[PDB]
């Protein structure tokens, strides 16, 4: 008999899918929540609510015999509701560095009882990311000293909501051989003309999606104080994909990569 596995959290789906896909004799992906957006076979499965807001009923209604969650699932009552039901839910962490991402795949493939795919897609993910700090160490994107980089989750505002120490874009742009132009605080904040001065970022990072929450590049670099920054006086905006950049999953290696490629044209 065939497993029927529900995935919660965008990266831990995507392991999943790079492990084999959406079917195997093993196991059947049947469910997601709304976060799991890749590969597209991801996109196309049934959604039981966003990440932190389960319906325990929702993903009960799919008859699940495994649930893959990320730590961050929630909220509590609905895991203890779907544990309660004899399913096995398996946690796994989402901490912003490469060796939690090597621990996911070892780990999904190990409760999908698919090891040896697992040893196979660790073997490459391995060797990419090699390539990235290979490529990364070559060449400081500019040229010269680390450039300050401020990311932009999203612009709401009339300010910039940005990133702080212990997120996501943070560790992104340490390992694409950049400094966060935003220090002194965690996680995200609206961003103040004044911090943001101080900041003087040389290249500013916004969400592919999130451009569109302050109308296009021109429009947001009319943002107050944007223009007289050293990122405003060059107009260097780089926009990319929120959950490949950073969802921290088998991509990581290409999006350590690309983004220290896009900061490289950026700087040119
Ligand atoms: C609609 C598509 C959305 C996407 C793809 C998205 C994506 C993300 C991502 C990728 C992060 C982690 C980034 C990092 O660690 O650097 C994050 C954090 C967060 N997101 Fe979203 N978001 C979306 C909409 C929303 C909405 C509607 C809300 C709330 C009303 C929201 C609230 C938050 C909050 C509160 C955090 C944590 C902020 C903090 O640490 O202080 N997001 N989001
Ligand atoms: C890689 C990590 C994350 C991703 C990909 C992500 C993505 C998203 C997305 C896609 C939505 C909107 C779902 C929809 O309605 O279509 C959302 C909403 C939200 N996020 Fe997350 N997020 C992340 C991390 C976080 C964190 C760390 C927090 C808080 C500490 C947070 C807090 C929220 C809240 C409060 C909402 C409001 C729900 C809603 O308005 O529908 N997110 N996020």
């Given at each position: 008999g065939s497993k029927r596995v529900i995935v919660i959290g965008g990266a831990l789906a995507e392991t999943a899918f790079a492990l084999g896909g959406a079917e195997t004799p093993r196991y059947r992906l049947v469910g997601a929540d709304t976060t799991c957006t890749y590969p597209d076979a991801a996109k196309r499965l049934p959604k039981v609510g966003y990440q932190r807001a389960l319906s325990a009923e929702g993903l009960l209604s799919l008859r699940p015999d495994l649930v893959l969650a990320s730590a961050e699932a929630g909220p509590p009552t609905a895991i203890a509701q779907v544990k309660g039901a004899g399913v096995t839910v398996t946690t796994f962490d989402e901490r912003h560095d490469v060796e939690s991402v090597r621990a996911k795949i070892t780990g999904v493939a190990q409760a999908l009882d698919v090891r040896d795919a697992g040893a196979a897609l660790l073997q490459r993910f391995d060797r990419d990311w090699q390539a990235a700090r290979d490529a990364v160490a070559a060449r400081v994107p500019?040229?010269?000293?680390?450039?300050?980089?401020?990311?932009?989750?999203?612009?709401?505002?009339?300010?910039?909501?940005?990133?702080?120490?212990?997120?996501?874009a943070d560790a992104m742009i340490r390992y694409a051989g950049a400094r966060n132009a935003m220090q002194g605080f965690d996680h995200y904040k609206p961003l103040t003309t004044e911090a943001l001065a101080a900041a003087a970022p040389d290249v500013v990072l916004?969400?592919?999606?999130?451009?569109?929450?302050?109308?296009?590049?021109?429009?947001?670099?009319?943002?107050?104080?944007?223009?007289?920054?050293?990122?405003?006086?060059?107009?260097?905006?780089?926009?990319?994909?929120?959950?490949?950049?950073?969802?921290?999953?088998?991509?990581?290696?290409?999006?350590?990569?690309?983004?220290?490629?896009?900061?490289?044209?950026?700087?040119?």
């Open positions: 500019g040229g010269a000293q680390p450039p300050r980089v401020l990311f932009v989750l999203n612009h709401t505002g009339t300010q910039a909501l940005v990133a702080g120490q212990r997120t996501a916004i969400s592919d999606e999130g451009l569109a929450a302050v109308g296009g590049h021109a429009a947001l670099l009319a943002t107050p104080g944007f223009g007289a920054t050293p990122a405003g006086r060059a107009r260097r905006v780089v926009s990319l994909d929120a959950l490949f950049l950073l969802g921290f999953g088998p991509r990581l290696p290409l999006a350590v990569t690309t983004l220290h490629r896009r900061l490289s044209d950026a700087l040119a």
